[PDB]
C-alpha cells in the first residue's frame, strides 16, 4: 500500500561568445554540422 | 623492576581535581548511553568499582553493550606494533559522551538541510569544509596617522 | 595436430641442435633449418622443401600431398627443377603462390633455391 500511494503521488503530474562557440564547434558530436558548414563554405564560392 | 600493580603510577591520574572531591554529581548517572555511540573514558577515583585500567584513561571508544550500572566499550589499544580493539567493562561514572561525534552529527544534519534547501532554490552551495585559505588582498587605511616607529630598547641589568 | 606434435618435439627431437647459444633443426623439409613451428618440416599437413638434385645441377622441390598423411612412402611429391636461375625461381614462386600452398614459405624457398644455385656453379679462381 505504501508503494502504491507513493507511486500514484509521483505519477500525479499536473550572443557570440567566440571561445564558447569554438568549444562548441570543437566537440566531436555537437559540432559536426558546424564544421561541415565551414568546410562547404571554404570549398564553394558563389556570388551575391 | 617496575611492579605490575593495577594502579601503579596512578597517583595523580585517578585523583580528584582540586576542590571537586566529595559526592559525585548525579547528572553523570542520568546520561543515556545507547549502543554504538562514542564515549570518553576518564576513571575518577571516588568510585573504585568498575574502574578501567590506567591504559584506557583518556582513550575514546564505542559502546557495544549496556548493563545495569556499566557499559561495554570497544576501545583500541596499541600493543607493540599492532592495534587490537579491546572490549572493557566500565561503570558509567568513568565515562562521558564524546562531543566530536555530536559536532559531526549536527554538521551532517545541517548539510542535509542545506542540500534540501539548495535543491529547492536551485543555486549550488558549498558543503565540503575547506582549510584556512590564504587571505585575499585588502587596503589598510592610515587615517592620517603615521605608523608609530619602534626602536629596540637599550640594555640594562634589572635583576 | 601440428600444434600438439610441436609441443611434443619443440625441445626433444633428434633433429634438434642446441649449440653456441643457437638452435637448429635438421629434418629434411626445414627451410632456414631453424627449430620453429612455422618452419618445421614434419608436423605440418603441407610443407615444401628445396634440396639440390642428385646430380650437381638444379634443385628438387618436394611438397606434401594432403591424402596420405600417415603414409610416409607416398606422402611427398618431388619435382626436379633444372632450368636457369630466373626461370627456376619463377617456377618455385608459381608453385607456392599460385597454388596458395603455404604462402608463408615463399621467400624462404626462393632464398634457399638461390643459395643452392650459387653453390652449384664452379667457384672463381
Amino acid at each position: 500500500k505504501a508503494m502504491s500511494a507513493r507511486a500514484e503521488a509521483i505519477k500525479a503530474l499536473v550572443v557570440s561568445r567566440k571561445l564558447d562557440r569554438l568549444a562548441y564547434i570543437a566537440h566531436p558530436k555537437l559540432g559536426k554540422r558546424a564544421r561541415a558548414r565551414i568546410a562547404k563554405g571554404l570549398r564553394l564560392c558563389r556570388p551575391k | 623492576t617496575n611492579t605490575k600493580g593495577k594502579r601503579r603510577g596512578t597517583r595523580y591520574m585517578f585523583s580528584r581535581p582540586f576542590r571537586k572531591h566529595g559526592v559525585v554529581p548525579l547528572a553523570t548517572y542520568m546520561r543515556i548511553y545507547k549502543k554504538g555511540d562514542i564515549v570518553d573514558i576518564k576513571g575518577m577515583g571516588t568510585v573504585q568499582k568498575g574502574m578501567p585500567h590506567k591504559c584506557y584513561h583518556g582513550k575514546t571508544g564505542r559502546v557495544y553493550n549496556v548493563t545495569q550500572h556499566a557499559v561495554g566499550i570497544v576501545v583500541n589499544k596499541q600493543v607493540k606494533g599492532k592495534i587490537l580493539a579491546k572490549r572493557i567493562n566500565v561503570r558509567i561514572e568513568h565515562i562521558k559522551h564524546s562531543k566530536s561525534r555530536d559536532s559531526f552529527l549536527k554538521r551532517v544534519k545541517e548539510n542535509d538541510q542545506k542540500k534540501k534547501e539548495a535543491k529547492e532554490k536551485g543555486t549550488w552551495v558549498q558543503l565540503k569544509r575547506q582549510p584556512a585559505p590564504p587571505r585575499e588582498a585588502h587596503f589598510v587605511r592610515t587615517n592620517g596617522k603615521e605608523p608609530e616607529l619602534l626602536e629596540p630598547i637599550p640594555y640594562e641589568f634589572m635583576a | 595436430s601440428a600444434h600438439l606434435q610441436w609441443m611434443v618435439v619443440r625441445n626433444c627431437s633428434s633433429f634438434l641442435i642446441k649449440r653456441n647459444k643457437q638452435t637448429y633443426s635438421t629434418e629434411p623439409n626445414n627451410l632456414k633449418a631453424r627449430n620453429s613451428f612455422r618452419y618445421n618440416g614434419l608436423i605440418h599437413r603441407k610443407t615444401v622443401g628445396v634440396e639440390p638434385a642428385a646430380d650437381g645441377k638444379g634443385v628438387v622441390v618436394v611438397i606434401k600431398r594432403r591424402s596420405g598423411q600417415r603414409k610416409p612412402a607416398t606422402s611427398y611429391v618431388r619435382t626436379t627443377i633444372n632450368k636457369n636461375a630466373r626461370a627456376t625461381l619463377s617456377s618455385i614462386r608459381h608453385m607456392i603462390r599460385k597454388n596458395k600452398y603455404r604462402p608463408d614459405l615463399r621467400m624462404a624457398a626462393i632464398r634457399r633455391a638461390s643459395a643452392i644455385l650459387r653453390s652449384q656453379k664452379p667457384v672463381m679462381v
Binding site: - | - | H3, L4, M7, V8
Partner: protein, 187 residues
C-alpha cells in the same frame, strides 16, 4: 639515491602454469589470445584460473553445480568450471545441464549424458561462446580441505577451534592439561 622500499616491487602471481601438460599449455595459448584480443573479462578469469595449482582448483561436485544452476534466471546457461566435475551420489535426479569443465569424472559424465546433458571442453566453449556470453562461471569449495581445519589461531589459545596435529585420536591423546579445568586450565 631515491627513497623507495623495493621489497614489494616483484608481485607474486602465476604468469603461466607450472604444469608441463601439453594440452593444458595449448588451451592456455588459446585463452591467452582470447583474453588479449577481446574485452571479455570472463576470458581473463578463465586464463588466470588455468594457471592455478590443483589446491586452487578444487573439484566441483555434481550436487553443488546442480544447486547453482537451479537458481532463478540461470536457465539454459552454460556452467563453466576450471577443474573437475565430481559425481555426488547424494543427489538422485540430474536435470539437463550444459557444462564445460577441464575434467569430468566417468560416473559424473555418465549421469550427465544419460540425463540428456552436454559436456564441452574449453576449446569447444571457445568455439561456442568466445566472449563467455551466456555462461555461469562456478568454482568448487576452495577451503574444503583438511589443511584449513589446522590453519588459524593456535589450538592452545583461548577461543580457537583449530584442529591440532595428532598421530592418533583418543582419550590419551592431548586431552588432559589445557583441555579441561580439572587439570590446570581449559582456555
Amino acid at each position: 639515491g631515491v627513497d623507495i622500499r623495493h621489497n614489494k616491487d616483484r608481485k607474486v602471481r602465476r604468469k603461466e602454469p607450472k604444469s608441463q601438460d601439453i594440452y593444458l599449455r595449448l588451451l592456455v595459448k588459446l585463452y591467452r589470445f582470447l583474453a588479449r584480443r577481446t574485452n571479455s573479462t570472463f576470458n581473463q578469469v578463465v586464463l588466470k584460473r588455468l594457471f592455478m595449482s590443483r589446491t586452487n582448483r578444487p573439484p566441483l561436485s555434481l550436487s553443488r553445480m546442480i544447486r547453482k544452476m537451479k537458481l532463478p534466471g540461470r536457465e539454459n546457461k552454460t556452467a563453466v568450471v576450471v577443474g573437475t566435475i565430481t559425481d555426488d551420489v547424494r543427489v538422485q535426479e540430474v536435470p539437463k545441464l550444459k557444462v564445460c569443465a577441464l575434467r569430468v569424472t566417468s560416473r559424473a559424465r555418465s549421469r550427465i549424458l544419460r540425463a540428456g546433458g552436454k559436456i564441452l571442453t574449453f576449446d569447444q566453449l571457445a568455439l561456442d561462446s568466445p566472449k563467455g556470453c551466456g555462461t555461469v562461471l562456478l568454482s568448487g569449495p576452495r577451503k574444503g580441505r583438511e589443511v584449513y581445519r589446522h590453519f588459524g589461531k593456535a589450538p592452545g589459545t583461548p577461543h580457537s577451534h583449530t584442529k591440532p596435529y595428532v598421530r592418533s585420536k583418543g582419550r590419551k591423546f592431548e586431552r588432559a592439561r589445557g583441555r579441561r579445568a580439572s587439570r590446570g586450565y581449559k582456555n
